[PDB]
Design a protein around this nucleic acid. Structure first.
Ligand SMILES: [Mg+2]
Ligand SMILES: [Mg+2]
Ligand SMILES: [Mg+2]
Ligand SMILES: [Mg+2]
Lengths: 49, 31, 48, 290, 43
RNA sequence: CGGGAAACCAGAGUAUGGUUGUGAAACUUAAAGGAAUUGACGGAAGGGCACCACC
RNA sequence: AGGAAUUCCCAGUAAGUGCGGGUCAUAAGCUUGCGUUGAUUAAGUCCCUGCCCUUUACACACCGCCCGU
């Protein structure tokens, strides 16, 4: 969704996302982002802006 | 008592005696 | 990736990473008392 | 009226662009004045056109308005007239959001709260301008807790965007009673930078001129770009000893956007300041204090 | 494009010798202005 | 009329840093124990107002 | 078809219905826009529960001293 994107494959549980909230992430293209909040529908996805 | 500070103040009061037209033209000369 | 690593492995890993932004401040009694001390000082001096 | 409003906006924007030029022209004028008063060299920059600035010095007087300020143009009637504040919510408000909006009416003297039904945002601003509403407040909620606040100055004034962090309302606390409703004293603390002065001005002009003997105090304290809102009433039991009783809501503010236009002008208004969280050094930087 | 870029390098160097050569002459002019201060009031 | 250097004799501004310029607590929130023709309160009445009250 | 208590609400308002966006903050079973249909009662008093003030511009007319420590 424009800036906001849904990411899977980095983690495998909701406990994992809670440990790494606010971590700096980036793409191969060089766009920098932030981990915001975990998602429930798959096991280890999260929301990132 | 500073002479340099007093010297300017004495000058300005005197020039107003000349007149406002003469006040101006003398002021241009100083600048 | 997540597939290679076992489940819940990173919980004990103690990795190092960086945070993007500052965390929100936590309110406690001590912060309340210092803030009230500031308010009382302005009241005495009429520093409105 | 619509033509008049458009004309006043172009006049305001025209003056804002030339504000910096007049300040530099004013600054050069004072340097020449010091050189004349104390006999010294005219500065080499001021050596040419010195006569023209000297001619201007004679023409300057207390009668002129002086250098213009875009802040003064926005808050023209800040001191002379009492502000008129209107509070509204997002469409289909929650139960607790309506309860929060009821309390904000009590905090601001003379404020009014109106129901938001199927009103278009642009239509709301048009009605506020017609009836002389000075400031408009819009509050957002998430899962029954207030999360965002927008403050807009109606006569093409600045629009400030806030996010609420730790909201505790009077309705949660039992058996408090009734509020004082007197004109309050304002305490501003922690704002030292230029932007902090800009933000504190917007919050202060929401309130009217109080009385000297008023016992109502509202405090805005800045700490690491977080503004704490506190409301208190004090009693002087004896000299030098004062008691404080907390009344009213308690919440935190974090500014992230200031725009020149009104909230109906999202697609056109310029941004005076914005928070950039993806900056490489954004984590270790603060903006409301020096 | 490179020719214009090549040209701009010399005026950057040229202005450097311009200010240094003018610098020695500037001090002599400044000393003359001192005498005008004492006679500024007289005329 | 002769020479005058290709002659003759033998300067201010900012900015950024430095350097300097016999006890009031171990004791005390009773104005270290005040000021006052100037100070500190109480009651009653009147004028308003509220989806913090009524109907 | 949701007791006792308790909260909110005056006109395109209460309530119902759909269709979008995710906009450098917040927001995922959630957040915010936009349109559609559209009501009952009320336009006045200080009786309860409280709040803000007062009791020292001489047209006509009206009116003719708040109290106590
Ligand atoms: Mg509704
Ligand atoms: Mg509706
Ligand atoms: Mg029911
Ligand atoms: Mg709907």
């Amino acid at each position: 969704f424009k800036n906001t994107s849904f990411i899977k494959g980095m983690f495998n549980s909701a406990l994992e996302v809670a440990k790494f909230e606010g971590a700096v992430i980036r793409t191969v293209s060089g766009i920098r982002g932030q981990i915001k909040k975990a998602l429930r529908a798959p096991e280890g996805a999260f929301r990132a802006s | 008592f500073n002479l340099e500070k007093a010297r300017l103040e004495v000058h300005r009061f005197g020039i107003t005696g000349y007149g406002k037209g003469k006040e101006r033209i003398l002021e241009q000369e100083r600048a | 990736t997540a597939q290679k690593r076992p489940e819940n492995s990173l919980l004990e890993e103690t990795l190092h990473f960086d945070h993007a932004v500052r965390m929100a401040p936590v309110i406690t009694e001590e912060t309340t008392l210092q803030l009230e001390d500031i308010i009382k000082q302005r009241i005495r001096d009429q520093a409105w | 009226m619509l033509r008049r409003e458009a004309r006043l906006r172009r006049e305001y924007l025209y003056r804002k662009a030339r504000e910096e030029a007049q300040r530099s022209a004013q600054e050069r004028k004072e340097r020449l004045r010091r050189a004349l008063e104390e006999n010294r060299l005219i500065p080499t920059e001021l050596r040419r056109e010195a006569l023209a600035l000297q001619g201007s010095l004679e023409f300057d007087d207390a009668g002129g308005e002086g250098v213009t300020s875009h802040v003064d143009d926005e808050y023209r009637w800040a001191g002379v007239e009492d502000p008129k504040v209107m509070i509204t919510t997002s469409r289909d408000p929650s139960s607790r959001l309506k309860m929060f909006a009821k309390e904000l009416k009590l905090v601001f003297p003379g404020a009014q709260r109106m129901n938001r039904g199927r009103h278009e945002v642009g239509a709301l601003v048009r009605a506020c301008k017609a009836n002389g509403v000075t400031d408009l407040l819009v509050v957002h909620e998430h899962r029954g807790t207030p999360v965002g606040l927008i403050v807009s100055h109606l006569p093409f004034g600045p629009t400030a965007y806030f996010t609420l962090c730790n909201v505790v309302m009077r309705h949660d606390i039992p058996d408090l009673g009734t509020m004082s409703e007197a004109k309050p004293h304002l305490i501003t603390h922690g704002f030292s930078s230029r932007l902090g002065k800009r933000v504190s001005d917007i919050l202060r002009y929401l309130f009217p001129v109080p009385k000297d003997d008023s016992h109502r105090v509202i405090t805005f304290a800045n700490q690491d770009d977080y503004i704490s809102f506190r409301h208190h009433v004090y009693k002087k039991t004896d000299h030098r000893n004062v008691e404080l009783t907390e009344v009213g809501p308690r919440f935190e503010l974090k500014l992230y956007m200031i725009r020149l236009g009104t909230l109906e002008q999202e697609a056109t208004a310029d941004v005076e300041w914005r928070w950039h969280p993806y900056t490489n050094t954004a984590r270790k930087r603060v903006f409301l204090s020096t | 494009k490179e020719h214009f870029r090549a040209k701009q390098k010399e005026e950057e160097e040229k202005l450097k010798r311009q200010k240094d050569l003018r610098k020695k002459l500037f001090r002599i002019q400044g000393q003359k202005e001192r005498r005008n201060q004492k006679s500024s009031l007289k005329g």
